[PDB]
Design a protein around this nucleic acid. Sequence first.
DNA 1: CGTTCAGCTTT
DNA 2: TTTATACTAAGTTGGCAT
DNA 3: ATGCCAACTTAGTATAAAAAAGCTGAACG
DNA 4: ACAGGTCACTATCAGTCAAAATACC
DNA 5: GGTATTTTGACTGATAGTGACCTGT
DNA 6: CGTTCAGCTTT
DNA 7: TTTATACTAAGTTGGCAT
DNA 8: ATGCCAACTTAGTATAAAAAAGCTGAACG
DNA 9: ACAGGTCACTATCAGTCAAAATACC
DNA 10: GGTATTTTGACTGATAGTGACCTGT
Lengths: 349, 350, 349, 350
Amino acid sequence: ERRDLPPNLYIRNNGYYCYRDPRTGKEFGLGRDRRIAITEAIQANIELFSGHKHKPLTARINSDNSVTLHSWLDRYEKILASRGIKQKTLINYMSKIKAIRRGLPDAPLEDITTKEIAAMLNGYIDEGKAASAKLIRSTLSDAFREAIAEGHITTNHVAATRAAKSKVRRSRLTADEYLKIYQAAESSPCWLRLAMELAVVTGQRVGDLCEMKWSDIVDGYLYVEQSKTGVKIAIPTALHIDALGISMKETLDKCKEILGGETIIASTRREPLSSGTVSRYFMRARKASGLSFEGDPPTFHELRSLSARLYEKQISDKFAQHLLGHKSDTMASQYRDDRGREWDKIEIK
Amino acid sequence: HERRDLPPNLYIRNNGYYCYRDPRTGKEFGLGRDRRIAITEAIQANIELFSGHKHKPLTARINSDNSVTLHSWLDRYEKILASRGIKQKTLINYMSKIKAIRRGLPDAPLEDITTKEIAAMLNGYIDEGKAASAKLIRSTLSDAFREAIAEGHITTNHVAATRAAKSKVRRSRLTADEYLKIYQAAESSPCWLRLAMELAVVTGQRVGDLCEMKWSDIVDGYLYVEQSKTGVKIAIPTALHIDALGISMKETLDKCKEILGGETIIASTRREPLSSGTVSRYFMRARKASGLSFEGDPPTFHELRSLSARLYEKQISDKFAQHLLGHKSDTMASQYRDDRGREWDKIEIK
Amino acid sequence: ERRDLPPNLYIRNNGYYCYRDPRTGKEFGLGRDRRIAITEAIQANIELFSGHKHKPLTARINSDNSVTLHSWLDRYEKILASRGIKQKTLINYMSKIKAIRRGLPDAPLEDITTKEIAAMLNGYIDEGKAASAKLIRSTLSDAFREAIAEGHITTNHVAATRAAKSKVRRSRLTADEYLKIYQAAESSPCWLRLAMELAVVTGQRVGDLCEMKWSDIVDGYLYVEQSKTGVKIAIPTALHIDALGISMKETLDKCKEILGGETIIASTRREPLSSGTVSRYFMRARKASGLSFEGDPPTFHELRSLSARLYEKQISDKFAQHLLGHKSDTMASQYRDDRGREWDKIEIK
Amino acid sequence: HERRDLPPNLYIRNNGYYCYRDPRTGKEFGLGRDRRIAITEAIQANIELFSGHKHKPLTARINSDNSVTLHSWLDRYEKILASRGIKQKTLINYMSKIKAIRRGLPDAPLEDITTKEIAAMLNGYIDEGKAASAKLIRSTLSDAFREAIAEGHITTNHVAATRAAKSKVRRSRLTADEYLKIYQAAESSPCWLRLAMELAVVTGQRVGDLCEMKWSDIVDGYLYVEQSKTGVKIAIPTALHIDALGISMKETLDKCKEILGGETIIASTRREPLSSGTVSRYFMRARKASGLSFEGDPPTFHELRSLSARLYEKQISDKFAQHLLGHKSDTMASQYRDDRGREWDKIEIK
DNA sequence: CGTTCAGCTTT
DNA sequence: TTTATACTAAGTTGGCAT
DNA sequence: ATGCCAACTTAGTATAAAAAAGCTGAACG
DNA sequence: ACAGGTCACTATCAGTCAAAATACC
DNA sequence: GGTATTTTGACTGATAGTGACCTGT
DNA sequence: CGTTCAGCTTT
DNA sequence: TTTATACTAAGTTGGCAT
DNA sequence: ATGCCAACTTAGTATAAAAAAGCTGAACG
DNA sequence: ACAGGTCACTATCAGTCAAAATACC
DNA sequence: GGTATTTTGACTGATAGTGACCTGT
């Protein structure tokens, strides 16, 4: 040749210049102006080294006014702190944000793409953390909605994302399985078995269980104000689960002598238990039982459903619903769900 | 002014450094020394902003029917509301929210009023814990803007993108024991206060309606009430009796006609009709005087109606409570029936 | 002076030229270029004569591609014809369109303003035809939505309009009033009284009433398939309205002898009646009764509500609801509405 | 090419008439003879269109990750659906709708695909009365577009602005008398058809599940069915009996094991399991052979389940019908319970 | 005692 | 025929530190 | 034995604009 | 010594307003 | 006579170039 | 008799 | 506390024409 | 007497995407 | 006679593609 | 040797000026 043509740039028969993106291999037309052609090509080949943009003035102006992701997330945390949400709730959010920080760059909100967000989320889905994905997506979407209401963005680049599937893996618990575990929990601290009984017979959540004080029992009724919902109920000490042969009263007595503390359930040192701990030992006794389940094993919380289902058949739907504290039927008809374990025997009633 | 091919918005520095100046912010931007490139991008940026510079006075015939100011508009919006045909009280609620807007936003051209600005104001209210207000102000702001859009003074409603602040009712409920206790503190107060309290609980009516019951509204064992708030028309049988508080509607009425003596069932010492505000106010006096303590905001006279509902719900029937209160479907009831965290659900083995 | 300055155009101290709209009185800046200034002013003063635009090329291009209101409405009628709607329904729509044709110009859809639409609607509201306004608005909005789904517009300039108030003026009918009318209907053709009885006792709509054939009564049940809803019911001839002393059976007998035709209700010539006619004579007997009502008087249709309300108290809510054919409770709880006439006596039940 | 200050898109005629030519339509526009004015407006119009002409190959780095074609995309969209983890049948339903799209739209760049075009296709289906299809095709089209937006191949979903066509079910219901009549025509058909018909009515199960009941699914007076469609798991008591049709589940099963003899309760003459399509098909044969006439579309084998539901609803209970069918809440039931205009509501004096 | 204005929260 | 939605508040269980 | 952080999966609860009141500190007679 | 850009400050923009000038019933 | 509508020019809050002037390196 | 493919309508 | 929404299908009653 | 058009006010009925089937004319052995 | 604009038709756009040329492990 | 990535130029479906040429007046 006889050319200064820089690489990537070709000249055609008429003298028409074209660039060739080497990543796509598709070319681009420049014109006949070799001076301008080369010029642009140089600037294009410099972008191939590193991605530093001779960014237009337009974009520059839109950007230096508008707000950055991580910066918005700092602000966002402040918004939540003000929603009047419970501490745990805030803890959860913080977590999702933390994830968002790891997953997305700190660039102009307006410049985070649906594609980018999508990529992150699938990242969670491919590790099998579909749940986390759904939640993260949610949080991000809400952070965006807020970015919108304070007028930093204008549209929600997430509203466009694949809101993950919601398959529930934890297996339900059958009465028999309960018994087998109950037995395996022989070599476990005394409070476990008791915890377990108290749980099924009251149908309260582990959190609330572990906070029940003897001073909450007045005239044969156990007063409970549920931490998660604020529902307030009085449970008659006179309950009985005929199917498992559990008596609330009898069980309350064993707790009184064997456990003795201010809290109905207590440690070997007469001190209150962390709900996690209780959950933990149940798990242990469960492994020690050596039972087999499809997918994920039942957990301590599953005693609630077992309670409800057991009181469903022994007493009534309504009782079960009241004992659990569901103002809504959507929830009650969900604890009534067997999740593939049991066959619904159709009665001619 | 010049000796330059320099397009607008681009200034040259003493060294020959070219920068674009955004006119919206007034902050400038660095380009480099390559005037050819500098101007080039400046033109492109000028196209994004001030596309052109010209406006055929024809374009005057366009942007004309457009230019108006928030306050000059609020002024017009008021008159609109005046023709809407709404009750005096409502209009008052509205006018107030407008006023808040007037003190919260600049009198700029509607078109220039930012979502960001609005939210800023709205958040001002939320941060002072006046969330309730924030909602209503937002609500009204949105309505004004709509109307301006109707008259094509704007194209877009910038309020819409903003969200409504959610706010949990604070006000606490009133338990029978508490009522009794308040009633006791009532002894220093006028005779009518007690009678009002009793009547309020037994009849379950709104204080506004209570204050307007006349003796002529009683016929053949029935107290006729046409509710001022909703237009619901009911007749209450003068035979009711609250068991938990030992109140007799007959007896209470009786005490009323002998002691109070006036054209209205409740009446001032001066034997004249009472304002609903006063009934409330005096009750509030008693409540303080009773020294009770509550979570959140303290119960007010309107809480006597919820107590009423709740007691009747048990003594008689849910169905009854509804009818007494004057609730049309099966929905608004499920609200007065609610005790908002004051009661323990005694589980029966049924 | 020493100027050709055209009218409306002033020159300021620096030599700055301004136009003055004479309708607003606000001025407009042109520049220092007297040649251009005048030029533009001329073109502006010519627009003051008539409104003919030296319309830009931009608008010209957007317009000659896009679609016209009346033209869209012609098309629109075709869309409805295809929705599978009943004839009356179509008749109503046609009407609203006709109104739209009278109310709005035949210009580019994209160029009909919220303001213009608004103006029309208020026009109806000020004549006191609030109802019509609501319906028109509706129709127009739907025509627009359709213009949107076939990609002619992009936004619904109506979604922004004041959807009118919906006050219902027609007064309900009390049993007494029924009686007084029933009596006033002495000098009216025999079929009126009968119509009236049959109506209250069956609770069917006038349309359906006037189409009942003797061949629709099998084994003591009156078979009815309601024209407006397609509901199908069988009414026992054994009904009775104790409050008005009406017997369905007795009434059916009088119709058989005195009226005799294929249709249960018939004219003096033994021929079927147009529902309008029946409505008309009721009205007449109503005037002749000389009763006074607040707002609008009751009409024949109000016998339905009276029927329902009467059967509510005599028999049951459920019966009344079934007899009327309401699958929904929203409707039934609406015929239960007294509309300011009667005081709901609270029973201790 | 020229000797002209003429900007692009503006051509001059032999008389000296200037016109702008819209490049999108290709139709030109008249301006006049005033070249100064002509060009002026042409520039303004050129700014609205092709703002500029330049694209820093930097702008290549932008529009690159953008350009893709409907069919090249449908190709990619397929593979996506393949990873979605859906049942074979579903995927099949989807692939079909894609195919319709492939035959209905040009293989143009996504960005260029108009709402107007889409609707045009969609209306094509509606006008042939295939409304049902129109809905589903629309639905899937929308999903594909979303996915492309996710991969930033487009910015906007042009399907969204389009509406879903509403379509009333045509298919008529099956009355007990009709069933009987069809059963009678069945005599020419295989022995299994009748047995299937009976079993279908008595058990109220989906034909797909019927065909897969094995004799081993019966234990201690109970027929266990895990529904293929929904995963619902039920046990049917082999004691049921439809009164209006004189069917005995025991008897019908009995006839089955003696006559049919195969591993499945219903079985082919060849003593092998039957396809659900065939059961349906043969029923359809009978229906024609019976000579009955109906409004709208004729009843099919799946209509035996509605008959089932309806009869049981009366004979036993609404509650029962639900449980038999396998319906979780209190909602999906209120559908099978519906007779869609086949029955007269006998009014009782209750 | 008891009223009207205002700015907030509740039906 | 089934589910979705937008928040909120847990429960589950692996680890590292006492 | 144990206690507390951290990343994940699961329970729980439900509309939003209009319209109309009701509450209560001030200033006032 | 300089990239990068903030900052007060005039000369003109762009236009409002209230008398003076003048047209219309 | 008596009101309404242009001219006209004094008077005023904005803008956009300007060169002086901060500042992190 | 009985199967799979396809294009439509229904759960 | 009450209402909204998006269609669809009537009923109501004034007139002009038989 | 009446019948049919026309402009108005009132009744009536309710989600929309995913997922999974079921129906039935052809061509085929 | 002309406003207003449609219509086929080249010369170049703008770029794809598959060998030739050449660089990289 | 053996694969991958530039050059290069023949080859191709688009576009935008063009003057000839319809048409309602």
